[model samples]
Target: YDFVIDEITYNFTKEHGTVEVSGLREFLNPLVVNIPPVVTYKDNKYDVVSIGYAAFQGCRKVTEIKIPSTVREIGEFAFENCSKLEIINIPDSVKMIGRCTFSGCYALKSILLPLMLKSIGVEAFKGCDFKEITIPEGVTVIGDEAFATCESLEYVSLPDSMETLHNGLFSGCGKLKSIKLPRNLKIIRDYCFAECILLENMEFPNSLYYLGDFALSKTGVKNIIIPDSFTELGKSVFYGCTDLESISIQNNKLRIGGSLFYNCSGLKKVIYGSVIVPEKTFYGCSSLTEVKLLDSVKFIGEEAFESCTSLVSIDLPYLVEEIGKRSFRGCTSLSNINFPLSLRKIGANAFQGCINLKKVELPKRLEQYRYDFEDTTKFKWIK
Candidate 1:
């Protein structure tokens, strides 16, 4: 129990509930008044329920919590990375919980959410080892890395209030399965749900945009639909999604980053957009079968599709200037790469380790190929 923001509201009584902290170190030589770990607050007037920003950071020994009904919002980084935290309860009256509220609570088990909750901040629950948790229906946004590395979690249910899923929020939960994502949701950040080995099904919304890094890496999801609203995607967003089978990103504005969809072993159908992902966007998607790069794209980065053993056919954009080094290393399944006439530079090792590559079709305007290729490959000069 901490500061009592509201006086006239209500107070639940207990015999003995004390804040536990250890080793008060003295600053400035002269010891100042020892600060209490938990400050019990009871005002003489006013009723409010919000914890301000940076309220309680680095509180390492907080083992128990007793929240009053008057508490509403938990501020940003209020209890970030509290390694020894054990328990917490949120009443349905709370509206929003800020970022990093309970991140890195290795032993945390339970949390109660308010029915009025409208949003949750990024990394709110990263590395919390909770057994089970429920997403309240009133929550609208799940921020990036909100629940990453919750190793003991068994399952999580996204309530209907959710409208967006940021990347890597629920990654590293080995036992997760069957999340109930909102169909009305719009944006999904990259790596939003990466490293969930047991997760099976996920459904995307029609208005999503800005999917960020490693969004679904190493998860069990088999299929995903990139809605029309999607425009920007982050790096290695789906790198380790071994079970992903099909991807359809069709919007013209969908700009992808480096290694955006790498290592999706089961990926079969990927529909590229006019916007180009930064080079090396699919570096490790080993099972990628077929990709159709849109003509609107102008460049492909080095090692962008390396180690994609299943890739067979691809059509490059026409306006590209340079190809980066090792852009397609170890892509055993690559057979044909059609270059555009406007291409200029080919960096070293651009295709150094493509073991299965047989023939390449290049543009005449291409001038330089950098020796950045690390693996052993012979390059010939054509003047």
Candidate 2:
């Protein structure tokens, strides 16, 4: 049923009357296997067209593999956990590289992908040591966590034809400093580039319409300008991006999410464009000194500006209708406020701990908390 030739074990296939290298007779140190184009079985020859699944899985001693041009596919886990495998030469005939094919190849320094490659399965090359990679053209789909936790990878060039970028595509790539995104890319799924600490700059194309939740959280981006093309902001989209200094929103009718910039202590300026300030949008942005809200804004959501210790003054839009609960609570430096005539209700503890708020003109028929004006001792109320 099997035979060993030149230290390689070959399995005889009765259906095709061919022999394929399935294993090594002895676990050779620093193994270098060269797969032949054809092997004989019963005096019949057949091309070794594929590398079977788990063909050489966990072969830690293997340092290199030479695949012939006749091989068209490398099966799932074909060479997984080959920790010492430093080089792999994929032939141009390969059309698909299966799941976990080269995963955990820690010593692998470089690889040459073929031009005909179309699909790369989930976690295909994860945790490798390659410093750079260029995804060739014609690749349509890249599965989730394809390159997750590849710390040594510094640069990547994605093809322009790629449409969807699945979740956690490059998550936890701490040293990845730069990347060139595809122009036709539309949807960036959840946590696609989350925790990439060294990513300093990024440019989104005009065609982009959706950005999933926690997409770029905890990155090193310094400034951001959300283009007018996006419709709604995902929850905690920019949560805890400490290095961010300024944000300029250009979409006028966009709907914001809760805790969008929570704990961004370095954020100093925000030019908001929407009408309603979503719940906890700026919950703990302590360094925020300037805010620009459009005249179209109507409602200020619950705790929208809570604990914003640097704001000196606030002027609500003439069209404002409701002030949510604890909306301006703990604003330590807020000394002035312009209440509008359109105001209908002020929720409980709305201005509770505003220590420096000296005066305010109350709106006629305005519904306010029982003790909304609690903490300010220097309070001076006017009609």
Candidate 3:
């Protein structure tokens, strides 16, 4: 059944015996929407249960919207592109906000999400200009791209009930200076915090299991402690975190991805528990001056420190056995290297570009030597 009242349209749900706010007049009279809780039709009253899909989408002149406690759902794209909307109130009865529900409300200032909300769909509020957003504690599933590209977003307080930080969840939130993660977080999907240039810090516990591709790349994060619970890390986790100064890996058996810290030029120290340094792991770390390898490390993967120009020395661990090809190829300032007694192999061109390194008194037990360290008269390679 359909009926119009107070410039608002309503539809009666025969199955549920309830009414939904279905539409509005092309031109609102006072620019304020106050959805009533009950509507009378044919001598019978019905409860207003929800706001229909795109019912108020592109309603440019509506500045304020207030829903009643009886509303249970805010349908997909319900208020999308409402460019002039300044404030809106969501009641506790709403449990879910559907996809693109508030995607382009550019003039929106702040929002108090429904207290009983349990799920938020894709791009639910993307491109909105809210300076801060505090999600209610009951929300558990905030879909991917839910708040992407909101340039004015500054602070966000997520609920402890959430576990997975979805793909591109807060990507491109350039002004985001603070965020609180769930204490029991388990997975951080692709580009979760990517391109957040002002996000300077974060606190993550050991409950994490996986960190997806470019998770923290191009951010302003300054420090990170790869937790012991991490089972796997995706590509370029800190690809261009120029402000990152140091990193400590707690798990030796975790699977790693490429260029974990590829261009972290501000990195100065690294302490690892792993048995090997993965390929191109720190390829362009121009400020690294020290690498504290534990007794468990035994190998250095290909081009692992290829362009770490400021690294002046190598203190190979007692258990180190081999150095992969071009492992320290472009360490221009490297002047000292003490090979451990356990080392038996050195890949070709491992120190091919070390022009300042002029001494080598390798142990007698060293048998497999396949490198060509610059010029013999200039570079002393003694055995």
Q: TM-score for every candidate vs. truth?
A: 0.62, 0.87, 0.83
C-alpha lDDT (0 to 100) for residue 319 of candidate 3: 87
lDDT (CA) for every model shown?
A: 0.65, 0.79, 0.84
Q: Who wins the TM-score comparison? A: 2
> What is the C-alpha lDDT profile of model 3 across 1-383, one tens digit per residue?
27887878887765466988887865445488889998888888888988988988888888888888888778899999888888788887788988999998988889988777888999998989989988889887899999998899998989986889999999889999878788899899999989898898677766878999999988897777887778999888888888889988857787888788999999999987777788888989999998888887888888888889999987888888888888888788888888777887888788888877777767655434524466641433456
Candidate 1 residue lDDT tens string, 286-382: 7777787776666667777777777877777767666666677676666677666677777676766665555454433443443334233333333
Tell me the lDDT of model 3 at 86: 86
Which segments of candidate 2 are over 4 A away from where they belong?
1-15, 18-31, 39-46, 370-374, 377-383
Q: Compare candidates 1 and 2 on TM-score and give the better one.
A: 2
Clashes of each: 41, 0, 0
What is the C-alpha lDDT profile of model 2 across 1-383, one tens digit per residue?
27666656677654464555576666447779888888765666767777777778888988988888877767888888888999789989887878888888878878878887898888878778889888879776777878877778898888798867888888888888777778977888888888888888678877787777778777788898888888777877888888988998757788677778877778999888688888888888898888877787888889988898998887787888888999988888888787788888888888878888876767435533436865443433445
- After superposition, candidate 1 runs with Cα above 4 Å error: 1-132, 137-146, 152-168, 265-269, 275-277, 294-298, 309-324, 330-345, 354-383
Candidate numbers, best lDDT first, in rank order = 3, 2, 1
Worst 10 residues of 1 by lDDT: 6-15
Q: Candidate 2 — which pairs collide?
A: none
Better of 1 and 3 by lDDT: 3
